[PDB]
Structure 1
Amino acid sequence: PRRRVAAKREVLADPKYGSQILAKFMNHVMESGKKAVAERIVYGALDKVKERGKADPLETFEKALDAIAPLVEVKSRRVGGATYQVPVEVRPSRRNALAMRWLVDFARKRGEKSMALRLAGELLDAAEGKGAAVKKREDVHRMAEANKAFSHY
């Protein structure tokens, strides 16, 4: 058991778009602390999104994450000597973070040339709601709505 309040880390806004929402997306796509390398990916990705349709690469990011962020999720829970996967709502602080999770993870496993156009490829592919990250969202939503029997916390 713990008594700690953990820690409240703050993220500074991105320098090219003035949106802290991209800052945690940058914070998510990180590998080995290479800040400069990864930010070259998103801006190149956002240029690809902007160059292919749309009007602003920042607003389709907003459109992308809601289609990825689930509204409910189960967790392993033991009450009566057995595991009951009680579906629980996802808090606003976690839904966007896990939205940033599933965009990079499934785009990393795509077959496109480089991540620069691979996260970009998923960005519009997820904004319209027909991508694998969108697919992963609904099966989690499929995991719930079937275990609805267990609703005690």
Structure 2
Amino acid sequence: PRRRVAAKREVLADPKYGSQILAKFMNHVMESGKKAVAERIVYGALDKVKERGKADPLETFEKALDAIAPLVEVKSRRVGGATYQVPVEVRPSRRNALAMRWLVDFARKRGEKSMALRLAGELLDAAEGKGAAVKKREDVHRMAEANKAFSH
């Protein structure tokens, strides 16, 4: 807007795990106002992660998130005569939402049985970085690096 008066309502409604990042992932994965469906999907994926990896799924989710969080991104700018793209570093808050959005978007289109094992596969892949989300993050990064002549 033009005022900068908009507030920031805080939502932290983790039922049993008591995690903040999990709550925002819930809000991201929720569709058409179906909270219960999101709860069941995310918890099934989490339980699959647990039954697969001996490590506790909390830290696996955290390290998958921290391996998909970008640092800089390319943004278009209207110079008045040319189509230019400038690299800008991410705001510390925005990278979490970017990672969540990328993860859910890439998980939505696997083609396997259900989003339980879809999100399970994505979390395992991004835990060390063999998922498509990490590849596209690296592609965005290499855009930003190849457009470093502007930088500023």
Give the TM-score normalised by structure 2.
Answer: 0.94
Question: Is the Cα–Cα contact under 8 Å of residues 12 and 20 in structure 1 kept in the other structure?
Answer: yes
Mapped partners of 2:6, 2:75: distance in 1: 21
Question: Is the Cα–Cα contact under 8 Å of residues 13 and 22 in structure 1 kept in the other structure?
Answer: no
Q: Secondary structure at the match of 1:44?
A: helix
Mapped partners of 2:95, 2:104: distance in 1: 15
Measure how far apart 1:4 and its partner are: 3.2
Give the match for residue 23 of structure 2: 23
Q: Secondary structure at the match of 2:67?
A: helix
Give the TM-score normalised by structure 1.
Answer: 0.93
Question: Is the Cα–Cα contact under 8 Å of residues 50 and 57 in structure 1 kept in the other structure?
Answer: yes
Structure 2: gaps (5+ residues): none
Measure how far apart 1:9 and its partner are: 2.0
CA RMSD, Structure 1 to Structure 2 (Å): 1.3
Mapped partners of 2:11, 2:75: distance in 1: 28
Measure how far apart 1:139 and its partner are: 0.3
Once the two structures are superposed, residues 122-151 of structure 1 have per-residue CA deviations (whole angstroms, 9 ceiling, x without a partner) of 111111100001111100011111000112
Q: Secondary structure at the match of 1:55?
A: coil
Mapped partners of 1:26, 1:38: distance in 2: 6
The total of aligned residue pairs comes to 152
Give the match for residue 62 of structure 1: 62
Mapped partners of 1:37, 1:13: distance in 2: 15
Structure 1: gaps (5+ residues): none
